[PDB]
Amino acid sequence: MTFKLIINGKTLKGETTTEAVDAATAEKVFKQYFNDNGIDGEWTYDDATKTFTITE
């Protein structure tokens, strides 16, 4: 299970992706990834393709 964090904002524009030991294991970590960036907006996890997208 590979997750991808996409930041949709003029302030910060980036994209990353990687695999982990487990879906939930990476889901709990990927949540803190952007947490450090302090990105304020609509943060949600796309259960569809396990993709994390944010909309400021």
Side-chain angles (χ1 to χ4, degrees):
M1 314 301 211
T2 69
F3 274 91
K4 176 187 285 155
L5 320 88
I6 309 92
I7 308 90
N8 205 329
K10 208 153 281 160
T11 67
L12 203 163
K13 275 274 273 89
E15 177 271 308
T16 69
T17 319
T18 176
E19 187 174 325
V21 297
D22 210 52
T25 302
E27 171 272 325
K28 56 178 207 161
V29 180
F30 269 55
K31 267 202 177 156
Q32 170 177 225
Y33 265 43
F34 76 89
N35 190 72
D36 207 67
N37 296 9
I39 302 164
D40 201 85
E42 179 159 31
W43 57 271
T44 331
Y45 276 69
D46 306 314
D47 80 272
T49 68
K50 291 84 168 273
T51 309
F52 175 63
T53 318
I54 302 172
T55 324
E56 296 162 22

